Amino acid sequence: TVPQCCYGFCIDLLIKLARTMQFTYEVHLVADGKFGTQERVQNSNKKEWN
Amino acid sequence: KIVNIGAVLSTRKHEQMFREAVNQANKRIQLQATSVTHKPNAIQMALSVCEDLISSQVYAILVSHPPTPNDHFTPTPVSYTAGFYRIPVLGLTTRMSIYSDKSIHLSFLRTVPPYSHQSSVWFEMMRVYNWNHIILLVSDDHEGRAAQKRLETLLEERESKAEKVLQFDPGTKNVTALLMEARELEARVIILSASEDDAATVYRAAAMLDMTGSGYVWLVGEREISGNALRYAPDGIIGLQLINGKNESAHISDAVGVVAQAVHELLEKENITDPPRGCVGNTNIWKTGPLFKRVLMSSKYADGVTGRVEFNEDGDRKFAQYSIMNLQNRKLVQVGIYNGTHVIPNDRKIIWPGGETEKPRGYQMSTRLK
Amino acid sequence: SIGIAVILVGTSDEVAIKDAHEKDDFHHLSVVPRVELVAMNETDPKSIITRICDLMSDRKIQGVVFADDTDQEAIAQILDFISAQTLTPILGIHGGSSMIMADKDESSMFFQFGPSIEQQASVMLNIMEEYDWYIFSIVTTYFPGYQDFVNKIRSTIENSFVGWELEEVLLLDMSLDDGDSKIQNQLKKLQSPIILLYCTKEEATYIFEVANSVGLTGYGYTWIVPSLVAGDTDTVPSEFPTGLISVSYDEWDYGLPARVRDGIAIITTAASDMLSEHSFIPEPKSSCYNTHEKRIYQSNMLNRYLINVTFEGRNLSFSEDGYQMHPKLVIILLNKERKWERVGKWKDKSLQMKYYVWPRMDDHLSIVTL
């Protein structure tokens, strides 16, 4: 992992929310880089989201 | 006619007490007494049980715990030997959760509450204290699995999932890895269910990580309070204890009364066959096993010396009494009693963990988010 | 030079098994195992224990293959308990010892030939998928194995890429008094054309009588039952609906002497390989009484090595639960005259039916298309 810089529309909305309801945050990216899908392959007998 | 009964106990003084109890119950169809001692092996125990069943041809066998601390190996040989002819067997001082499913142990009657009832006791205690976020810490074992399943069922009854469940290996040398993960949550009501040996090892790691101060509550069971755990037990821990668990003569009278009622209700049926006395001769299944067990399971006792005696679905003695103990200044003291319906506290005061007289909230508010 | 015993019960061609035992060739393994063939009656489990003790104390018996012509599971339970107590490895060839007990002991060394509860459910699901059926419901009695199988089937069918429609699940209890009316009222809620039943023979007959009173078993109903619902293909309760489908173990094609010889050879080869590699051979004092101190020599290595063996181009590796990895199963059907006719065979997750078109039991047209 490496520290990078993030900004944009979602970041501005996040800052607005954190200001309006007074909480703190530690944003970090996702490792998989995928939006999300529920892998339910019967090979491992388990189903989970990615 | 005359039909005798059998039993297996130690402390021959207890055998004389059982003989006196049988002589007293004879005044209430003639019954005799036949008892033997315990052997230092399981094969010899099974051989002696077969010999005694051949000699007496009894229809029910009473089994209790020996002077051994484990008290788990003795129920296996007698039950395994008596399950051949489908002969019913009644247990007096057996509390292991391994003998809960009727699959392994076919015929079994209980006179004490299993460790599964501790889950319902903890649910009632948490409902009394108005908590909604708990952490279940149980050791990987059959008893731990049953205690986790009962608690999960009681929680899902109200559609409330557990905050976090952490499992550890039995006899693990290091448990700090699980404690580090458990200390990164927002709940403060931690429930512990393990053996007395691992109890002290967990308590040491909890006290070293400053997890026993103010704002935390400890919910443990009977096994976590006995043993050497009290040497490393923290103040304010709330434990459980059976009312008459240590006593063994009081349950004997109730079991004898229930067996006498069942025998009186059994001899008035058609197609009744006595258990075969041909141990080495016959290896068939006695047809009087299923019906007698079904009649004895529903044989609700009106009144006894240890309270109302009933039987659950999976052969469990319900309606037990518990003494809510508390450890204050290295001395345990009772604080209440739960008679099934609810827990009625006494006039004594409760010293919570950390010395806080006020009842702790048992919860925190997370402010840093990811 | 390990002595293995082979005990027979009832009438059996011992002379035919002697040739198969003598024809065994294990020169590469260098085991040189001696065979001790003994015959005995169905006297009792105590007589079986005495015979096992005598055979062990006779000449360095390090293994036993026990077969019986009876049908009681108590014999298999007593054999498993004796094997766990004596810490010696015993195997179940066929008959009553072939019964699959649900929960095995932790510190036990037992091996049997047969499929698991999940294997039967998988075979039934594969047969239903082959039969183009895509909807079914489940009904089970108060047996815990039935609940376990239902949970396993639900977990297996839940994570399926293909479609599936489950109407409802029934957990009616037949032990209640005067509750047959409620069961009959609840059975009318079934609407799917396929239903699976998990109960015992008497319970299955009672449920079939109740359903025939309801009438949902004549034309558009298909029932699937486990291997324990039939038990004996020779006897029929005459209350089962025509066309019932059920799985069973391969007993018509498998040869008993060949299977016994193969098991003995596999055990000898595994023991020889283990004694050659680990260089530790367990030969304790083969006594029955006073076996508490006999646990000084741990035999867990033999149990760990007994789950991986192969000989004569066959895979006989067991599982952690004590069940064979690749068993041979059969699927039979009921004809007009009460009897069981072999329809298909399943092995290694591969099914094979004896007909491309199912026998339907003028509609059902046939159309030709280019």
Add this chain to the structure above:
Amino acid sequence: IQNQLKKLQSPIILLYCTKEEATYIFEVANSVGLTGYGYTWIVPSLVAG
């Protein structure tokens, strides 16, 4: 008659019989159970009297 009464699937049914016959048919239907929640019966003026 009880086996044939199970073939009914509509939520409304009209009955034309006498008082004793109506009572017998109602007992048979209650034995079948199709009269509790989703069943509605209509009878003539001669069924009550």
